[PDB]
Design an enzyme around this catalytic site. Structure first.
Site, PDB file in Angstrom:
ATOM      1  N   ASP A   1      -2.038  -0.432   6.142  1.00 53.31           N
ATOM      2  CA  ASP A   1      -2.309   0.295   7.375  1.00 53.31           C
ATOM      3  C   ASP A   1      -3.767   0.683   7.616  1.00 53.31           C
ATOM      4  O   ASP A   1      -4.242   0.606   8.751  1.00 53.31           O
ATOM      5  CB  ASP A   1      -1.465   1.571   7.406  1.00 53.31           C
ATOM      6  CG  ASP A   1      -1.890   2.582   6.353  1.00 53.31           C
ATOM      7  OD1 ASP A   1      -2.001   2.206   5.168  1.00 53.31           O
ATOM      8  OD2 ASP A   1      -2.126   3.753   6.716  1.00 53.31           O
TER       9      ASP A   1
ATOM     10  N   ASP B   1      -7.311  -1.748   3.331  1.00 54.43           N
ATOM     11  CA  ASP B   1      -6.433  -2.894   3.195  1.00 54.43           C
ATOM     12  C   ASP B   1      -6.965  -4.118   3.926  1.00 54.43           C
ATOM     13  O   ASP B   1      -6.394  -5.203   3.772  1.00 54.43           O
ATOM     14  CB  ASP B   1      -5.035  -2.561   3.722  1.00 54.43           C
ATOM     15  CG  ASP B   1      -4.398  -1.407   2.983  1.00 54.43           C
ATOM     16  OD1 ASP B   1      -4.464  -1.393   1.737  1.00 54.43           O
ATOM     17  OD2 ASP B   1      -3.828  -0.516   3.648  1.00 54.43           O
TER      18      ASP B   1
ATOM     19  N   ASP C   1       0.867  -1.160   0.000  1.00 55.74           N
ATOM     20  CA  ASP C   1       0.000   0.000   0.000  1.00 55.74           C
ATOM     21  C   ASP C   1       0.931   1.246   0.000  1.00 55.74           C
ATOM     22  O   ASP C   1       2.099   1.148   0.477  1.00 55.74           O
ATOM     23  CB  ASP C   1      -0.967   0.048   1.192  1.00 55.74           C
ATOM     24  CG  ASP C   1      -1.782   1.308   1.387  1.00 55.74           C
ATOM     25  OD1 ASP C   1      -2.791   1.492   0.581  1.00 55.74           O
ATOM     26  OD2 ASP C   1      -1.583   2.178   2.260  1.00 55.74           O
TER      27      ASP C   1
HETATM   28 MG   LIG Z   1      -2.930   3.228   3.621  1.00 59.92          MG
END
Ligand SMILES: [Mg+2]
Ligand SMILES: *[C@@H]1O[C@H](CO[C@@H]2O[C@@H](C)[C@@H](O)[C@@H](O)[C@@H]2O)[C@@H](O[C@@H]2O[C@H](CO)[C@@H](O[C@@H]3O[C@H](CO[C@H]4O[C@H](CO)[C@@H](O)[C@H](O)[C@@H]4O)[C@@H](O)[C@H](O[C@H]4O[C@H](CO)[C@@H](O)[C@H](O)[C@@H]4O)[C@@H]3O)[C@H](O)[C@H]2NC(C)=O)[C@H](O)[C@H]1NC(C)=O
Ligand SMILES: CCCCCCCC/C=C\CCCCCCCC(=O)OC[C@H](COP(=O)(O)OCC[N+](C)(C)C)OC(=O)CCCCCCC/C=C\CCCCCCCC
Ligand SMILES: CCCCCCCC/C=C\CCCCCCCC(=O)OC[C@H](COP(=O)(O)OCC[N+](C)(C)C)OC(=O)CCCCCCC/C=C\CCCCCCCC
Ligand SMILES: CCCCCCCC/C=C\CCCCCCCC(=O)OC[C@H](COP(=O)(O)OCC[N+](C)(C)C)OC(=O)CCCCCCC/C=C\CCCCCCCC
Ligand SMILES: CCCCCCCC/C=C\CCCCCCCC(=O)OC[C@H](COP(=O)(O)OCC[N+](C)(C)C)OC(=O)CCCCCCC/C=C\CCCCCCCC
Ligand SMILES: CCCCCCCC/C=C\CCCCCCCC(=O)OC[C@H](COP(=O)(O)OCC[N+](C)(C)C)OC(=O)CCCCCCC/C=C\CCCCCCCC
Ligand SMILES: CCCCCCCC/C=C\CCCCCCCC(=O)OC[C@H](COP(=O)(O)OCC[N+](C)(C)C)OC(=O)CCCCCCC/C=C\CCCCCCCC
Ligand SMILES: CCCCCCCC/C=C\CCCCCCCC(=O)OC[C@H](COP(=O)(O)OCC[N+](C)(C)C)OC(=O)CCCCCCC/C=C\CCCCCCCC
Ligand SMILES: C[C@@H]1O[C@@H](O[C@H]2C[C@@H](O)[C@]3(CO)[C@H]4[C@H](O)C[C@]5(C)[C@@H](C6=CC(=O)OC6)CC[C@]5(O)[C@@H]4CC[C@]3(O)C2)[C@H](O)[C@H](O)[C@H]1O
Ligand SMILES: *[C@@H]1O[C@H](CO)[C@@H](O[C@@H]2O[C@H](CO)[C@@H](O)[C@H](O)[C@H]2NC(C)=O)[C@H](O)[C@H]1NC(C)=O
Ligand SMILES: CC(C)CCC[C@@H](C)[C@H]1CC[C@H]2[C@@H]3CC=C4C[C@@H](O)CC[C@]4(C)[C@H]3CC[C@]12C
Ligand SMILES: CC(C)CCC[C@@H](C)[C@H]1CC[C@H]2[C@@H]3CC=C4C[C@@H](O)CC[C@]4(C)[C@H]3CC[C@]12C
Ligand SMILES: CC(C)CCC[C@@H](C)[C@H]1CC[C@H]2[C@@H]3CC=C4C[C@@H](O)CC[C@]4(C)[C@H]3CC[C@]12C
Ligand SMILES: CC(C)CCC[C@@H](C)[C@H]1CC[C@H]2[C@@H]3CC=C4C[C@@H](O)CC[C@]4(C)[C@H]3CC[C@]12C
Ligand code: NA
Ligand code: NA
Lengths: 40, 294, 993
Positions: free
Chosen positions: C687, C691, C346
């Protein structure tokens, strides 16, 4: 020898066990020494 | 998967490899295992070269001799009916197998049997444990010595009318000299009478104090009429140096046995180089459970 | 819980009006709802709070640990043992209790292993519970025409809700009136900068429009009003969390390897059992005995101690990770990192820092770079010119933000600053290399200022001059470089002033395009000294008319800014690429920024090019170039929505550097699935909540600890409590090291199986006295052997592990036939021969020569034969020969230990030699010493021949296994030699594990 050959049928297992235990103890000690040798 | 990993027709493979591969692996394992076998055999041959043919290097696990008998009891119990004949057959068969080795026909000539004192005597040393002198000579032991239990008169040996016999025997040990207890003030009660130094005494009794009364007359038969083993039949020089050797035997008739009741009879030998063990119930002594149910 | 209706992309009613909205849900735009109606809806549908996760009693997970794949095999072994005992009990008298002891021992082993694994997972769960800090929150709702602050759990759909810069958006709102209200959509949509929320509609995509506020989002600056459109679990992040919870778990690679290992063990066990069953039936034995033989051989072919050894091995590798701040919730998730071959990462919050920082500065016709790293470990920018001082004064003065009270303890970069992001970055840079800004600001009193207009697009202000020799007035303005450029005529070069001729104007245009192409946001700072003769110290410049010269100013220099990546991000990405791990960027951010971050971190290696780059370098349309000449590709989310399965497969099959931009969480999950469809392991590092569906479906999820969200933290498998990205490299290294170590330990524990089964086989076929008892097999498998197998984990690498390519899952397994050919075929055979040698020696020294042992078992076992003739003619009672057999069991066990010495030394290394690696593993040495001391203790301690039935040995016997041990060492030493000199030869494809 002859008639009184009684020793031909005896074995000192006691002394053997004593020595084998002393040796086992020593080996265990040495092992511990090597294991802790470095953290002091 | 299932079919392919078994036989494919493009690479001409079977189980995974081609024809020459299975051969390479088989040849490698054959050579490897062959070397393994040859090395093990060599290390066992050096061993065969380390031992002597006339004497066992270690004789400490057989120091106190055992005390076996002629009948083969499954649980050290002798139970048989005086009516049904097919009840004591397993006993007579064994007894016979044991006595069948003392046949006079077997003991004949000067070699290798030698006539010994008809009365108990002392030890006899036929030299050392070597091959210098040829095959040593062993004393003869006649069947007839055992009077009412010999299978020569009453083949059954007693079991036919409620009077069984028990042929006791001392375990053969190489170079073992049996030594009996001396006449000093300390000796069991029983042993006092008939202290023939040259005889190793054997005496049976009852395990429990109660059973005493229910046990009748223990009649022992042996060499010279004594209840023991003559010292003249010792020592034993081993199979290699004394083939055709016969060990003394002692017959025991348990006359006047109470009917329909389990009796525990413990037989025991006495002597200096004889010691019992609480774990091995056959070291020096032996137990029998007789029950003549009729 | 319909998953397909949750897998679909979010839909909405944004494209409407304020009247249509109020007419659909029912609500007064100026009075809101009524208290009675509000409570009627509150009770009609439920509080605005997400459903709690599905709890889990502790006995359930303890029962889970008591089961599995290995423990199930041990369970069936114990069951079989008790079955054989019941048989022997109902068929014969005086049944040996060997089987019952073995069964209770196997059951105890399984229970202990379960307790240990459960305790470890509970430890991790407790340290994980110490992070959820939930403070109640109250929203501002307008009912009946009045403002009230009520708990977040009391907000319903339809009432009016007001927000203010600093608060959190309660539910999904529909903005009706805003006043310069910015929002932070980083967690949900992944937008690094604050998107302004306006009542008007702008994009067909609800995540892109500005008239909708989202759940869990915070209002950075401004105030706004809105009608609650979505509430409770029905919100966007509510559906995302529910989808995350409604996903399967999977099955790690280590588990599949253990399963295939059990498959091989059971194959050879049932084969040896059915074969010796037909053989025993062909030699005469009865059915009752043959069944016991079958059960005995099958149970004997089962490694009991390998379970505890494997559990301790994995736990050892887990504590190191916990020492470097890498915590794993499960126990097998420690190996998945090493087997990974495609890492999907990410951008916002993972690859970057999500914090605006001053990157580049322009002054004295020269581009200067500033340190943009968390711990400030870099290069200064030459703070020796006067130009920089003037720039610091402009930025430090023409700025209204100030650090939040009470931050005197935190560092200069992590403190809270109340204001815009640009002004915050400027304030931090000035406070970083120019000292306390509070004194720099009090040193010059601000007289008159002017905010950020939508027309002027410039912020100006006049302050007094702290020069004790000059009482003039200072004017400073800042804004867009074009507007500021059109208002100057001089340039502060190296301190002096110069005209604005076209030469520096073109250098300024090239600098503007240089900083702009870098994906950064650039601003311009200029100032001017007002003549104190035309504007005395007493004249007040009220902000009404043109009191200051807009033009003729002095431009000092440009100032760019952008969110920089974390310190160890480039190095870690390079390390992963070196190990053959494909790095694919997956983020829901703008492609113009995603591509720049990709090139800056190593995802898009410098030199590679996209189809658009080629079309721009050639000046030809994009439909003409061939897509095969482009190694790297940027796939937009809008285009990803209309792509078939084969197209995605080809995208991953032909492009080595892929960057998915503007992808929704559902699309992230689709990408992970598209990667798995081929056959490679996947590791997703994130995070935020977007996700969560990606971390769950991936083979292994890595969530950030400080900057991560609670949902993604609870749905991940590994947590980075320090937010350090290098931990990924450390993990991929440990995952391999512990794999080669598991192979070594398995071969070690499997070599002893043969010298523990051959005695019984020769006992049944050759009719010889039992060579190896049961309490000795137990003292070997569960005693001595444990320490060495555990020590085999501490083995260091042989070659560079971070250099070889990732292991192939379809071909390179954990337990192949090359191992079985060694343990069961070559080493175990030698160990069995050594044991039989010591056996025959013990029996030959006491009087039983090898020629008379074949055929004695019938009378050697009989309990009523007190006269067994030996090779010399002596008569042995039952207990005496049994004592000798027990002494043979003791010597056999000691011979096993003697050969295990050389087996542990040849198992230490798989390819390298002992004289190269070295005996630096102290644990292995301690294992050998303890292994010998335990055997000596079990034999010489009084009362052992009664409790365990082990008699003392005579000093000459202990030396019967030495030659076999040295031979084993020599054979394996020459084996590990042809492999080195001859790479790829027969010895390699035949004995190289
Ligand atoms: Mg992120
Ligand atoms: C050691 O000595 C054993 C006894 O020796 C006998 O007595 C000594 C003192 C000498 O006089 C010697 O010459 C004697 O033979 C000897 O065992 C004996 O072997 C013979 C030969 O097989 C047996 O004779 C056979 O008897 C059976 C029936 O036996 C019944 O009694 C015995 C118990 O005595 C039971 O065990 C049986 O089950 C029976 O209940 C006859 O049926 C058989 O018939 C055969 O001979 C006749 C002619 O007579 C033929 O018409 C038939 O066709 C048969 O061919 C024999 O008559 C004798 O029973 C047996 N005695 C014992 C006690 O078992 C032993 O072999 C010697 N061993 C060595 C190593 O020297
Ligand atoms: C680098 C790694 C280092 C590892 C070191 C490990 C430490 C070793 C620890 C101890 C070993 C020493 C043991 C000594 C014990 C002697 C005790 C003893 O009194 O024992 C007598 C027995 C004879 O018994 P019996 O049956 O005859 O009488 C029985 C008579 N009753 C029963 C009637 C009494 O004898 C015996 O046990 C013989 C004892 C065994 C003899 C030791 C052989 C050593 C083998 C190889 C080493 C060679 C080293 C070469 C140096 C190279 C330097 C570069
Ligand atoms: C950090 C530093 C750490 C250092 C720690 C050091 C620890 C201490 C080290 C060594 C201690 C040595 C103790 C020696 C004991 C000798 C006992 C002994 O010789 O007894 C022999 C006799 C039994 O002979 P028997 O006639 O029955 O033989 C059988 C004859 N048949 C079968 C033919 C009839 O004993 C008897 O009668 C009476 C026996 C009474 C019970 C004694 C208990 C001994 C048991 C364990 C102690 C040994 C531990 C050593 C450490 C090992 C670590 C792994
Ligand atoms: C009293 C006397 C004592 C007796 C004691 C006996 C102790 C027993 C000792 C060892 C047990 C041997 C049992 C067989 C072990 C075979 C190992 C095995 O099955 O491992 C499994 C492997 C799988 O491996 P992978 O996962 O890497 O495959 C990957 C394939 N991918 C990647 C292409 C998909 O499957 C394979 O290897 C394919 C299967 C090959 C099976 C070969 C069978 C050979 C067995 C006996 C031959 C005897 C002939 C004797 C006559 C010779 C002529 C003179
Ligand atoms: C007939 C009887 C048959 C018996 C068969 C079974 C035998 C199995 C038992 C022992 C086998 C011993 C094999 C000896 C191997 C020695 C190898 C060696 O010496 O390789 C030298 C290494 C290499 O150094 P480098 O160049 O990489 O250093 C670089 C340093 N830099 C980085 C600073 C530059 O140096 C190092 O490993 C560092 C120093 C390590 C010193 C190890 C000494 C301990 C050795 C054995 C322990 C004894 C166990 C006894 C078990 C019995 C218990 C009763
Ligand atoms: C870093 C941490 C280091 C910690 C190291 C700890 C090391 C501990 C070292 C030594 C302690 C061991 C336990 C001591 C046992 C003393 C037993 C004892 O003194 O027995 C003496 C008497 C024998 O008398 P007697 O000769 O008249 O019998 C004649 C019998 N007739 C004539 C009928 C044959 O015993 C009897 O009677 C009954 C015998 C009772 C049997 C007890 C043996 C226990 C069995 C298994 C436990 C062993 C597990 C292994 C643990 C390894 C730990 C490392
Ligand atoms: C970290 C390093 C650890 C090292 C430790 C080594 C691990 C050991 C692993 C497995 C060994 C355990 C096997 C248990 C064997 C029990 C044997 C048993 O129950 O035999 C029953 C015998 C009956 O015999 P009989 O019929 O001939 O009697 C005839 C009596 N007449 C004739 C006079 C009436 O009764 C007797 O011996 C009575 C005396 C009872 C002796 C119980 C000894 C228990 C020994 C160990 C259990 C604790 C181990 C826990 C440590 C785990 C380590 C991970
Ligand atoms: C008490 C316990 C005692 C145990 C003693 C065990 C001693 C037995 C040791 C070795 C005997 C086995 C020799 C087998 C020779 C026939 C094997 C054969 O037919 O092989 C053919 C290949 C040549 O084909 P290629 O590779 O060119 O074709 C390429 C084809 N494609 C593609 C499949 C690779 O051969 C090659 O590669 C050459 C490889 C040859 C194998 C070397 C292994 C040497 C291992 C140990 C010897 C050291 C003994 C030390 C003992 C000291 C005692 C004190
Ligand atoms: C032919 C048969 O031989 C004897 O019995 C035999 C079968 C059975 O009784 C047992 C005790 O149960 C077996 C048991 O089955 C399997 C084992 C537990 C096995 C394993 C070790 C391991 O680790 O996993 C499995 C190796 C041998 C074993 O250790 C014992 C050894 C003693 C023995 O006694 C031997 C009796 O004399 C019987 O009367 C006679 O009929
Ligand atoms: C053998 O045992 C019997 C008993 O079973 C003894 O005979 C008994 O003697 C008592 C007198 O003490 C009489 O009252 C019984 O009537 C007798 N019973 C029988 C069956 O005779 C006999 O004396 C014992 N004989 C020997 C030699 O021990
Ligand atoms: C590093 C390597 C080569 C060292 C090998 C050491 C071997 C030979 C050592 C380890 C343990 C030792 C034995 C352990 C116990 C006993 C019992 C004791 O009462 C006499 C010595 C005796 C019989 C030892 C003989 C030598 C022995 C087997
Ligand atoms: C290094 C390795 C591979 C060599 C192995 C050699 C093997 C095959 C050798 C070593 C010792 C040899 C045996 C040793 C003793 C005897 C007894 C003798 O009266 C006849 C030969 C015979 C039966 C030998 C046969 C071959 C043999 C087993
Ligand atoms: C280099 C290699 C091939 C040499 C192998 C040597 C072999 C033959 C040696 C090594 C150890 C030796 C045995 C070790 C122990 C004993 C017990 C002792 O009370 C008598 C000798 C005896 C029975 C030995 C016989 C020969 C033997 C097996
Ligand atoms: C007790 C004695 C006589 C049994 C001897 C059994 C021997 C011949 C057995 C034991 C282990 C077996 C090998 C073990 C492993 C493999 C690998 C496999 O993929 C093919 C079969 C192959 C190559 C086997 C061939 C036969 C083998 C070597
Ligand atoms: Na086993
Ligand atoms: Na997962």
């Amino acid at each position: 020898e002859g008639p009184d050959n009684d020793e031909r049928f005896t074995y000192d297992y006691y002394r053997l066990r004593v020595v084998g235990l002393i040796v086992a103890a020593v080996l265990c000690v040495i092992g511990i020494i090597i294991l802790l040798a470095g953290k002091c | 998967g299932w079919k392919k990993f078994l036989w494919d027709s493009e690479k001409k493979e079977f189980l995974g490899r081609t024809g020459s591969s299975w051969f390479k692996i088989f040849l490698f394992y054959l050579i490897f295992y062959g070397c393994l076998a040859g090395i093990f055999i060599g290390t066992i041959q050096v061993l065969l070269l380390t031992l002597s043919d006339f004497e066992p290097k270690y004789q400490d696990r057989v120091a106190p001799p055992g005390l076996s008998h002629a009948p083969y009891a499954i649980k050290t119990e002798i139970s048989f009916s005086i009516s049904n004949p097919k009840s004591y057959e397993s006993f007579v068969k064994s007894m016979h197998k044991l006595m069948d080795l003392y046949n006079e026909s077997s003991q004949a000539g000067n070699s290798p049997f030698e006539d010994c004192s008809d009365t108990p005597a002392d030890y006899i040393k036929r030299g050392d444990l070597d091959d210098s002198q040829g095959q040593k000579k062993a004393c003869r032991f006649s069947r007839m010595w055992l009077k009412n239990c010999s299978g020569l008169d009453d083949t059954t040996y007693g079991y036919a009318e409620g009077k069984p016999c028990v042929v006791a025997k001392l375990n053969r040990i190489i170079g073992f000299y049996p030594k009996p207890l001396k006449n000093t003030t300390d000796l069991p009660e029983e042993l006092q009478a008939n202290y023939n130094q040259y005889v190793l005494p054997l005496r049976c009794a009852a395990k429990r104090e109660e059973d005493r009364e229910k046990i009748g007359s223990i009649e022992y038969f042996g060499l010279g009429g004594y209840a023991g083993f003559p010292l003249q039949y010792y020592p034993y020089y081993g199979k290699r140096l004394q083939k055709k050797y016969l060990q003394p035997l002692l017959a025991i008739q348990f006359t006047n046995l109470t009917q329909n009741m389990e009796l525990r009879i413990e037989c025991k030998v006495y002597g200096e180089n004889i010691d019992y063990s609480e774990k091995d119930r056959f070291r020096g002594r032996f137990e029998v459970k007789i029950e003549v149910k009729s | 819980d319909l998953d397909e209706l949750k897998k679909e992309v979010s839909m909405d009613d944004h494209k409407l009006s304020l009247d249509e909205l109020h007419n659909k849900y029912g609500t007064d735009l100026t009075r809101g709802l009524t208290n009675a109606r509000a409570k009627e809806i509150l009770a009609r549908d439920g509080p605005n709070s997400l459903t709690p996760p599905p709890t889990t009693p502790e006995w359930i997970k303890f029962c889970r640990q008591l089961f599995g794949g290995f423990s199930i095999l041990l369970w069936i072994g114990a069951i079989l043992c008790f079955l054989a005992y019941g048989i022997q009990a109902a068929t014969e008298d005086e049944p040996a209790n060997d089987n019952l002891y073995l069964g209770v021992v196997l059951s105890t082993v399984v229970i202990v292993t379960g307790c240990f694994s459960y305790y470890q997972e509970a430890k991790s769960s407790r340290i994980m519970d110490s992070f959820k800090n939930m403070v109640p929150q109250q929203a501002l709702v307008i009912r009946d025409g009045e403002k009230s602050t009520i708990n977040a759990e009391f907000v319903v759909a339809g009432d009016l809700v007001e927000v203010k810069g600093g608060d959190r958006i309660p539910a999904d709102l529909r903005i009706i009136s805003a006043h310069g209200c910015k929002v932070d959509n980083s967690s949900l949509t992944g937008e690094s900068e604050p998107q302004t929320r306006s009542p008007e509609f702008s994009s067909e995509n609800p995540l892109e429009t500005r008239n909708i506020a989202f759940f869990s989002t915070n209002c950075v600056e401004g105030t706004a009003r809105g009608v609650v459109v979505y509430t409770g679990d029905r919100t966007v992040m509510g559906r995302i969390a529910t989808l995350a919870s409604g996903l399967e778990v999977g099955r790690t690679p280590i588990a599949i390897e253990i399963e295939h290992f059990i498959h091989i063990i059971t194959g050879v066990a049932v084969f040896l059992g059915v074969s010796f069953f037909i053989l025993s039936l062909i030699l005469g034995y009865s059915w009752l005995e043959a069944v016991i033989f079958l059960i005995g051989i099958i149970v004997a072919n089962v490694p009991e101690g390998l379970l505890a050894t494997v559990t301790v091995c994995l736990t050892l590798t887990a504590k190191r990770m916990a020492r470097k701040n890498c915590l794993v919730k499960n126990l097998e998730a420690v190996e998945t990192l090493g087997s990974t071959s495609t890492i999907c990462s990410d951008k916002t919050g993972t690859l970057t820092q999500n914090r605006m920082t001053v990157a580049h500065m322009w002054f004295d016709n020269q581009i200067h770079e500033a340190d943009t790293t968390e711990n400030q470990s870099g290069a200064a920018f030459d703070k020796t010119s006067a130009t920089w001082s003037a720039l610091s004064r402009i930025a430090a003065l023409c700025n209204r933000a100030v650090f939040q009270a009470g931050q005197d303890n935190v560092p200069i970069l992590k403190r809270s600053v109340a204001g815009d992001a640009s002004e915050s970055a400027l304030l931090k840079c000035i406070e970083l290399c120019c000292g306390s800004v509070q004194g720099m600001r009090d040193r010059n009193p601000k007289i008159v200022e002017i905010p950020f207009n939508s027309t002027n697009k410039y912020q100006l202000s006049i302050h007094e001059n702290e020069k004790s020799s000059e009482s003039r007035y200072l004017l400073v303005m800042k804004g867009a470089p074009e507007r500021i450029l059109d208002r100057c005529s001089t340039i502060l070069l190296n301190g002096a002033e110069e005209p604005l001729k076209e030469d520096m104007k073109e250098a300024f245009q090239n600098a503007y395009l240089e900083l702009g192409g870098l994906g950064e946001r650039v601003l311009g700072f200029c100032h001017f000294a007002l003549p104190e003769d035309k504007y005395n110290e007493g004249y007040p410049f009220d902000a009404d008319e043109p009191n200051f010269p807009t033009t003729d100013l002095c431009f000092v220099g440009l100032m760019a800014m952008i969110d920089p990546p974390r310190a160890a991000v480039p190095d870690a990405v390079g390390k992963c690429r070196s190990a053959g791990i494909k790095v694919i960027m997956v983020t829901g951010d703008h492609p113009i920024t995603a591509k720049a971050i990709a090139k800056g971190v190593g995802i898009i290696s410098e030199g590679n090019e996209t189809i658009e780059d080629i079309a721009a370098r050639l000046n030809i349309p994009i439909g003409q170039v061939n897509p095969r000449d482009a190694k790297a590709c940027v796939v937009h989310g809008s285009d990803l929505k209309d792509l078939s399965t084969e197209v995605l497969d080809d995208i991953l099959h032909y492009h080595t550097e892929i960057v998915f931009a503007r992808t929704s969480p559902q699309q992230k999950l689709i990408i992970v699935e598209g990667c798995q469809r081929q056959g490679a392991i996947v590791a997703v590092t994130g995070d935020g909540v977007n996700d969560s569906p990606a971390l769950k479906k991936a083979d292994i999820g890595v969530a950030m600890g400080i900057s991560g969200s609670d949902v993604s933290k609870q749905a991940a498998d590994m947590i980075l409590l320090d937010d350090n990205f290098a931990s990924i490299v450390t993990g991929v290294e440990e995952g391999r090291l512990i794999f080669d170590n598991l192979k070594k330990s398995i071969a070690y524990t499997l070599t002893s199986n043969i010298p523990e089964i051959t005695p019984f086989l020769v006992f049944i076929i050759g009719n010889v006295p039992l060579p190896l008892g049961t309490v000795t097999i137990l003292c070997i498998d569960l005693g001595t052997d444990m320490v060495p197998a555990i020590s085999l984990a501490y083995e260091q690498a042989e070659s560079d592990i971070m250099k070889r390519q990732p292991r192939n899952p379809k071909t390179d397994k954990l337990v192949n036939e090359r191992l079985i050919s060694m343990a069961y075929g070559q080493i175990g055979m030698i160990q069995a021969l050594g044991g039989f040698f010591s056996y025959f020696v013990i029996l030959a020294e006491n009087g039983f020569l090898p020629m008379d042992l074949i055929g004695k078992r019938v009378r050697w076992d009989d309990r009523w034969i007190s006269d067994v003739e030996d090779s010399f003619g002596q008569q042995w009672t039952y207990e005496q020969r049994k004592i000798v057999e027990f002494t043979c069991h003791t010597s056999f066990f000691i011979s096993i230990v003697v050969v295990q010495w050389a087996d542990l030394i040849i198992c230490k290394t798989r390819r390298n030699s002992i004289f190269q690696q070295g005996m630096k593993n102290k644990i292995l040495i301690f294992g050998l010493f303890e292994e010998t001391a335990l055997a000596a203790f079990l034999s010489y301690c009084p009362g052992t021949d009664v409790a365990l039935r082990m008699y003392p040995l005579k000093p000459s016997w202990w030396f019967c296994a030495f030659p076999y041990s040295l031979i084993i060492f020599l054979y394996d030493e020459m084996r590990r030699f042809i492999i080195r000199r001859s790479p790829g030869g027969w010895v390699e494809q035949e004995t190289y594990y």
